[PDB]
Design a protein around this nucleic acid. Structure first.
Ligand SMILES: [Mg+2]
Lengths: 83, 100, 230, 147, 50, 230
RNA sequence: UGGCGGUAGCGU
């Protein structure tokens, strides 16, 4: 359900970091076991990542901010567990 | 047969060796999908000769391009023939005419 | 507006194959529509019977030649493909043909069980050039629809394939030419009613009225899904 | 259960393998290119669809992009696997993104041959054609009258 | 000579007839050119190329 | 299996609007989609009963190339707007309606004198606009029950109206359908991927439900083909 | 389930 990504590159810019962020998001869905926020109407990871880019929910900034938050919360949970 | 031709398809077929051109005129004695027997006329036997010409056709023989090379008789039993007439057409030939 | 109902008025059987049928009365719009639909259905989905598998007495493979016949086995299969046959009752028929002596071996020489009927006895099958040579063959006739290539029949490999059982492509369609020409009809005093004339050229294995009825039944069955909808 | 069983199922050609294949190809672009790739547009990706036959069906408009007439030319097809390659296929390999030529900026896709001919026959006007002087309310009624 | 031969065969001398579409049953607006042409089969099969 | 034929089992209906519908039907036998779509399109377009405006008389107007004060719309525009009007009639085939209005503003379909048998699908449909309060408008519209599309040039003299003063003839769009198109896509069943899937996009004038019109056309064709069933 | 050169031909 995606044939033109012009509205996606206009959202991200430079047409290059969009590929990297979409690849990271698709890897998060596929091997990372993440939950696709947008509805999944029988599609695989890459187009869910592209549509999430389109809707503006995910970009580079939100992605690494969420990654840092997950890292710090899991570190806190681990240190609580060992203590 | 090609509906529109230039007229030399007969010459091309005859000069090429795909066809089975009779060497001596006569009357067909035994026609078959494999062999043709020609009983030559009274003028054309050498002394002390049977006067029987045996033409052996080539059926489904491989070519240099992995294509079929088949020979099919065109004459009928009892049909008189003369020297130079076609007896069995080869590939892409119909009644002694090139048919690509 | 109380649409009138077309009826099959008369059938003109000029020859054993060529036929002309007339349908009337018909309204202005319905004529071309019915003509086109009937033409397509008759040309495509008309059932028939055809020869598929053959077995020669002493032929190992269809790329060979048999002594005494002036035609190759491939030519024999091609001639068998054009055979016209009607079964009237079962799906599988086995026919045996045995001939001896010099002469044109035709479809009339094929032994008939009586239920099976040959439409064209004049159809020549082969030619025996030598008197001592004899030809014995067994052919299989099956009822089907449309065109079935030999490769599709080969796909059934449950019983493997005995050597010498040659396979021939099946042309189950009994019709070869279909045309229609609607024209003006004189019924009552209305000048708008039209008569549809359908000219068909078949192989003689099917009746015109039966073919028309089958096509109409198929169209009605297809439109039954349209009628109900959701 | 194992890779050998999957291999056997594939060589047996069930219907489940066809359904699995249909699911796989759903949005997996494949790259098509010509042997004499001269300019940048020589290779482009497409979203393939299962068809019968033994030949690759190609879009008519993009043919002028490939400079490949349907007279026996052969296309070569490659299949990306990794996610980065698939996103490259969807983002830059795509033919939709390639609309302007990189040499002069003119559009690369351009209607040609029968297409434009049809449009010509749809725009030429006669004088005594049937229906002259009629007044219609919209294109829908025009289509109704024509059909 | 071609026109005379067509006249002998009772076919139209213009060489173009009125074809009817089989897909929709309509009639083509303009006459089209039909006739018997000799066509060959090149040794460029598809099964041995894929 | 000769009598057996494939039937669409996945009827899908999408309602883009109250009058626009898209019907997807699959699987269908090869070649059946094209003929079914062509027959349905022809029957829907040319052979559907319906009520539509035939002629209208306007006081002070004698010809098409005339003009009236207080209305910015030309007489041709008035005729086209009357053509766009859709009326549902059940009491009888032919009905005379009277529309009289004076003032400033849009004169829409809600201003027509309403009878019990007649019904207006779209009251908001604007017939004309009155730009002068002193000017008044008064038409006597004639609505008749007919079939298909009847151009005004057909009845320009065959009607033999003998030229009553102000009787302008208008085109009669009896068929409720406004635009119908049918496409055939490829569809796969098991290993066979040559099946036909029929997509029909059609719009109506709002008088009847699109699927109701499709059902009516299917019933009409089935009743036409009644004489050749079984 | 073994490919390395050479020769000729084919499509751009
Ligand atoms: Mg080329």
């Amino acid at each position: 359900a995606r044939v033109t990504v012009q509205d996606a590159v206009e959202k991200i810019g430079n047409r290059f970091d969009l590929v990297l962020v979409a690849a990271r998001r698709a890897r998060q869905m596929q091997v990372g076991g993440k939950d696709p926020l947008v509805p999944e109407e029988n599609d695989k990871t890459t187009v869910i990542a592209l549509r999430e880019i389109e809707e503006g929910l995910i970009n580079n900034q939100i992605l690494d901010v969420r990654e840092r938050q997950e890292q710090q919360e899991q570190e806190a949970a681990e240190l609580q567990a060992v203590t | 047969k090609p509906l529109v031709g230039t007229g030399m398809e007969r010459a091309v077929a005859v000069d090429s060796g795909v066809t089975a051109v009779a060497k001596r005129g006569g009357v067909v004695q035994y026609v078959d999908a494999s062999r043709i027997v020609i009983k030559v006329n009274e003028d054309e036997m050498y002394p002390g000769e049977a006067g029987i010409d045996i033409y052996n056709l080539t059926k489904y023989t491989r070519s240099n391009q992995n294509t079929c090379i088949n020979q099919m008789p065109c004459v009928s039993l009892g049909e008189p023939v003369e020297r130079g007439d076609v007896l069995a057409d080869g590939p892409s030939t119909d009644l002694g005419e090139l048919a690509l | 507006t109380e649409f009138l109902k077309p009826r099959l008025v008369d059938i003109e059987q000029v020859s054993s194959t060529h036929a002309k049928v007339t349908l009337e009365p018909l309204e202005r719009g319905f004529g071309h529509t019915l003509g086109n639909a009937l033409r397509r259905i008759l040309l495509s989905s008309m059932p028939g019977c055809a020869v598929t598998e053959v077995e020669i007495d002493g032929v190992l493979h269809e790329y060979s030649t048999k002594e005494g016949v002036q035609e190759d086995i491939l030519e024999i299969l091609l001639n068998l493909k054009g055979l016209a046959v009607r079964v009237q009752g079962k799906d599988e028929v086995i026919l045996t043909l045995n001939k001896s002596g010099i002469g044109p071996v035709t479809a009339a020489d094929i032994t008939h069980d009586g239920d099976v009927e040959i439409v064209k006895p004049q159809h020549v099958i082969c030619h025996l050039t030598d008197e001592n040579a004899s030809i014995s063959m067994r052919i299989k006739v099956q009822r089907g629809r449309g065109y079935v290539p030999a490769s599709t029949r080969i796909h059934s490999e449950e019983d493997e394939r005995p050597i010498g059982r040659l396979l021939v492509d099946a042309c189950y369609s009994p019709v070869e030419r279909i045309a229609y020409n609607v024209e003006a009809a004189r019924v009552e005093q209305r000048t708008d009613l039209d008569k549809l004339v359908i000219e068909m050229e078949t192989n003689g294995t099917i009746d015109p009225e039966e073919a028309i009825r089958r096509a109409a039944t198929i169209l009605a069955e297809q439109l039954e899904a349209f009628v109900d909808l959701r | 259960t194992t890779i050998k069983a999957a291999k056997k199922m594939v060589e047996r050609e069930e219907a489940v393998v066809w359904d699995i294949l249909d699911e796989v190809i759903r949005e997996h672009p494949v790259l098509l290119n010509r042997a004499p790739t001269l300019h940048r547009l020589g290779i482009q990706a497409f979203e393939p669809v299962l068809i019968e036959g033994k030949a690759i069906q190609l879009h008519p408009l993009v043919c002028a992009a490939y400079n490949a007439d349907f007279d026996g030319d052969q296309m070569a097809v490659h299949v990306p696997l990794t996610l980065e390659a698939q996103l490259e296929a969807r983002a830059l390999m795509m033919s939709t993104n390639n609309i302007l030529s990189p040499a002069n900026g003119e559009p690369i896709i351009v209607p040609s041959q029968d297409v434009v001919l049809g449009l010509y026959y749809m725009t030429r006007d006669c004088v005594n054609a049937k229906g002259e002087g009629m007044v219609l309310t919209g294109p829908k009624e025009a289509e109704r009258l024509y059909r | 000579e071609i026109k005379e031969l067509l006249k002998l065969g009772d076919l139209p001398t213009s060489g173009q007839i009125r074809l009817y579409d089989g897909r929709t049953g309509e009639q083509f607006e303009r006459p089209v050119t039909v006739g018997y042409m000799y066509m060959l089969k090149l040794n460029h099969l598809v099964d041995d190329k894929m």
